[PDB]
């Protein structure tokens, strides 16, 4: 698709049995083709004993058919097709769709239509094939049982109440994936899979007269049977104020909302394109105005947003959602209703509607004159969208003319009317998400309506106007420091400067930097430093990183960095502070200047702080009672005895002030710093900038911070607390070992050979292992080989697998073949050579070199690391990956 192809020629036809089909011929690229068939049936069409059947049928039509008793998918495998790359299917509420991208394209067209016709007209749906497929369906089921789905279901339950949708999720239930017989599948198939309920689209390098004869060849003889009439895609809208809790005991969601449901495709006698355009204008105007209203929210709500979503074929929902400091949902809903009320009093800002309308007229003008041309993958995406909702495509060129014509009949009076109908909807909903164990009882509807009438009678300030945008500039630094010494390592192209304030500069003049400057400033100022308060210091770090200098703001910062192709970011780990950035050589003063300003003049954006307080408070409330919280607390007392630090209570969090956070930041920013600089430029260019921005920052000697070191010994623990049917097996093991570049590579080699053998020892599927992984590195700051093995598996198998991995480790040192190693050595050798001139690796190794040697030696003689890889040395190291004397096992089982 490298030469864009123009607006294609569309041909549509209808077979005698009702089968509908669309042929779209592109000029190119050569041979490429795309084939799609929709069956207008989804899980909404299921009856009660048909849970998940639409989706199971989706799977099952790939198995035995009349022409292919060994399976349709298997004929496709034997002709070179691949699952997910060459064919796929998707099932949602309303439709089932089958996608084909034949490996040889145009040539495989009749092979493709034979397969689709088999799938839709001739599926055997055999019980014996069902019993084999059930393994795969259960696996798709088990994979999407997390907390995101359970909440997604909560949202569908509430916003689509009084409809078929909540009780008809696509995947269905575990019981019906286990117990539903293939005869139920055949009755479903025989009710819904008929040609007048199906439509086909073919896109690409095709001859329309020929593709049509093939579609006749394989689809025309299908019997023309009718499917039932349907008029149930729509919630039953009625005047009401429904009140719903959105709840899951593992969700940190803390939010409130008020929602209006209504028929969104009713255009009231006017142009339905014009109507859809009013919607876009209205949403853009509302999105601007609701943002400004952030100023009006009490401390208990933040991030007020308006969202509009389709919740049927014709009904949409309009929602105002806001985040809630846990505990303050009543106050938050009042604020939402207050702001909704304000939008009823006052018309939308007319300069917004003028600007927005103008931006749209601009793009529609351009669209109406430039001939539409697209790449193949683009054409498919555009045509598929319009074809899934059973509508003909309209060119972007023609759509521009339609928009211009509809903008002429649209003034702000219309926008306000459009917006006021939504707000006048009589079908209304109020939803609450309250995290963890926060005291909450669901309001009754009148308690809400009371609030509505309170704000209806109240006197309300006008809508907020747009604040004018502060565009920031860094200050003038004239203050200069001075370099006080120079140690030279010419053989690594590295100089090491000492600076008058105590900092130092490790400058590496790598040609691999090109015209960019790479800055890494490290220092001993981690959030566990003795002077600091661990939780406050991490929050200070995060807010400064996001706010920028004191006189700036989060948004003006992100703006300012983008205009300069500059990045700079703060990472405060437990033992270290690291600021990381890149800039074009030109903008070297901007990067050092931005760095100096984070150090000496840090900012806290009020909005960012408020958002982050709520993010922290909802996770605290969740984690005090969530499974995730209890696993992290047990893992800590198993591995460390006590938490190194802990998040605060919500009450203390609520009192945090920007002065107290800045206080924390300055303790971190006072630690002496080493600037690892990678830049290809003469010292005479780099020295003046280093003496002005970097050497003039006040510093004070800091102590090293003690590592968080896992305790030695054998401890184990089992907890039946999981909520999904799964067992979680984690075990930890270390062996103190001195760090050398070789020892680190030997460990990673041995862990690879380890990684495949602990798979042999444990590939019996009767063990029901869902996922397992094995990790091992010679950690350089801790100087110990640290190994982690983790399983997720079914619960009954669960305690046998550690036993066998343990055994697989004892076995391993005598089982490493020679051609394991020298295939890994060849693998390392080539992977290393990918890494030379890789700036990420050069920078990582310079920093590491100074950590262990206090010089840049590790930048040289990488070529002789490969030779530390012998068989005798990888065996002697594989014997050290698991140490039975230092072992921690943690087993999480489903709650009994």
């Amino acid at each position: 698709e490298e030469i864009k192809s123009p607006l294609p020629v569309f041909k549509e036809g209808t077979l005698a049995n009702g089968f509908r089909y669309t042929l779209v011929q592109l000029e190119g690229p050569k041979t490429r083709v795309d084939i799609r068939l929709i069956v207008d049936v989804g899980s909404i069409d299921e009856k009660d004993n048909e849970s998940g059947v639409a989706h199971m049928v989706e799977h099952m039509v790939f198995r035995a058919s009349d022409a292919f008793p060994q399976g349709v998918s298997t004929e496709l495998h034997k002709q070179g097709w691949g699952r997910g790359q060459s064919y796929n299917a998707v099932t949602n509420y309303e439709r089932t769709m089958y996608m084909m991208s034949p490996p040889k394209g145009n040539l495989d067209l009749g092979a493709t239509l034979q397969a689709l016709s088999q799938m839709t007209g001739h599926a055997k749906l055999l019980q014996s094939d069902l019993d084999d497929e059930r393994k795969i369906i259960l696996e798709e089921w088990r994979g999407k049982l997390g907390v995101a789905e359970r909440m997604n279901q909560q949202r569908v339950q509430a916003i689509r109440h009084d409809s078929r949708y909540p009780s008809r999720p696509v995947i269905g239930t575990e019981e019906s994936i286990n117990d539903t017989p293939a005869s139920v599948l055949q009755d479903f198939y025989q009710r819904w899979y008929h040609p007048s309920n199906m439509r086909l689209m073919i896109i690409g390098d095709i001859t329309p007269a020929d593709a049509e004869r093939e579609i006749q060849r394989y689809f025309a003889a299908l019997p023309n049977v009718a499917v039932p009439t349907r008029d149930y895609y729509e919630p039953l809208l009625k005047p009401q104020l429904k009140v719903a809790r959105l709840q899951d005991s593992q969700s940190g969601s803390s939010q409130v909302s008020f929602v209006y449901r209504f028929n969104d495709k009713d255009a009231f006698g006017q142009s339905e394109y014009r109507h859809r355009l009013l919607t876009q204008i209205t949403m853009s105007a509302v999105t601007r105005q609701v943002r400004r209203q952030k100023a009006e929210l009490p401390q208990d709500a933040s991030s007020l947003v308006v969202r509009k979503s389709d919740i049927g074929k014709t009904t949409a929902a309009l929602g105002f959602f806001a985040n809630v400091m846990p505990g303050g949902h009543d106050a938050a809903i009042s604020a939402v209703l207050k702001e909704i009320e304000r939008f009823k009093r006052y018309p939308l800002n007319e300069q917004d509607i003028t600007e927005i309308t103008s931006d749209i007229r601009e793009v529609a003008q351009r669209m109406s004159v430039t001939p539409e041309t697209r790449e193949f993958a683009d054409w498919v995406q555009q045509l598929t969208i319009v074809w899934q909702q059973d509508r003909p495509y309209v060119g972007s060129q023609q759509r521009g003319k339609d928009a211009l014509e509809a903008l002429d009949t649209i003034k702000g009076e219309d926008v306000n009317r459009h917006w006021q109908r939504w707000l006048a909807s009589p079908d209304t909903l109020a939803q609450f998400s309250v995290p963890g164990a926060t005291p909450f009882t669901l309001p009754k509807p009148d308690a809400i309506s009371k609030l509505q009438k309170q704000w209806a009678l109240a006197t309300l300030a006008p809508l907020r106007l747009e604040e004018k945008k502060i565009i920031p500039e860094l200050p003038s630094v004239t203050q200069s420091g001075k370099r006080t010494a120079v140690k030279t390592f010419a053989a690594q192209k590295v100089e090491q400067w000492q600076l008058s304030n105590g900092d130092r500069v490790v400058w590496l003049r790598a040609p691999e930097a090109g015209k960019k400057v790479y800055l890494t400033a490290t220092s001993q100022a981690g959030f566990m430093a003795t002077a600091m308060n661990p939780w406050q210091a991490q929050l200070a770090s995060q807010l400064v990183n996001q706010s920028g200098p004191a006189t700036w703001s989060g948004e003006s910062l992100s703006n300012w960095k983008k205009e300069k192709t500059l990045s700079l970011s703060i990472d405060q780990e437990a033992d270290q502070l690291t600021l990381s950035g890149t800039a074009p050589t030109e903008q070297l003063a901007s990067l050092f200047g931005l760095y100096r300003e984070l150090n000496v003049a840090p900012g806290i954006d009020p909005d960012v702080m408020k958002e982050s307080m709520m993010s922290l408070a909802r996770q605290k409330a969740n984690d005090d009672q969530s499974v995730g919280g209890k696993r992290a607390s047990e893992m800590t007392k198993l591995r460390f005895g006590e938490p190194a630090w802990q998040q605060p209570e919500i009450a203390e969090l609520k009192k945090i002030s920007a002065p107290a956070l800045l206080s924390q930041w300055h303790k971190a920013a006072s630690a002496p710093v080493t600037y690892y600089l990678i830049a290809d430029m003469p010292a005479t260019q780099l020295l003046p900038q280093v003496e002005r921005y970097l050497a003039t920052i006040p510093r004070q000697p800091a102590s090293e911070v003690k590592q968080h070191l896992a305790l030695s010994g054998k401890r184990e623990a089992t907890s039946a607390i999981n909520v999904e049917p799964r067992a979680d097996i984690l075990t930890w093991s270390f062996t103190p070992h001195a760090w050398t570049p070789q020892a680190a590579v030997q460990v990673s080699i041995a862990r690879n050979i380890a990684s495949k053998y602990l798979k042999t020892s444990l590939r019996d599927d009767a063990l029901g292992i869902y996922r397992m992984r094995v990790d091992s590195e010679l950690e350089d700051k801790k100087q110990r080989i640290e190994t982690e093995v983790s399983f997720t598996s079914a619960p009954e198998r669960a305690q046998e697998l550690w036993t066998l991995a343990e055994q697989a480790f004892s076995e391993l040192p005598t089982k490493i073949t020679q051609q394991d190693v020298d295939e890994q050595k060849a693998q390392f050798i080539r992977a290393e050579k990918g890494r030379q001139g890789d700036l990420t690796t050069i920078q990582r190794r310079l920093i590491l070199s100074y950590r262990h040697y206090n010089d840049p030696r590790y930048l040289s003689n990488a070529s002789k690391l490969a030779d530390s890889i012998t068989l005798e040395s990888v065996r002697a190291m594989s014997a050290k990956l698991y140490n039975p004397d230092n072992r921690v096992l943690y087993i999480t089982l489903p709650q009994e």
Binding site: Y273, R276, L277, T279, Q280, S284, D359, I360, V363, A364, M367, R399, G400, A403
Partner: peptide, 7 residues
């Protein structure tokens, strides 16, 4: 929905 892509 967006009917005319703007940015």
């Amino acid at each position: 929905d967006v009917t005319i892509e703007t940015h």
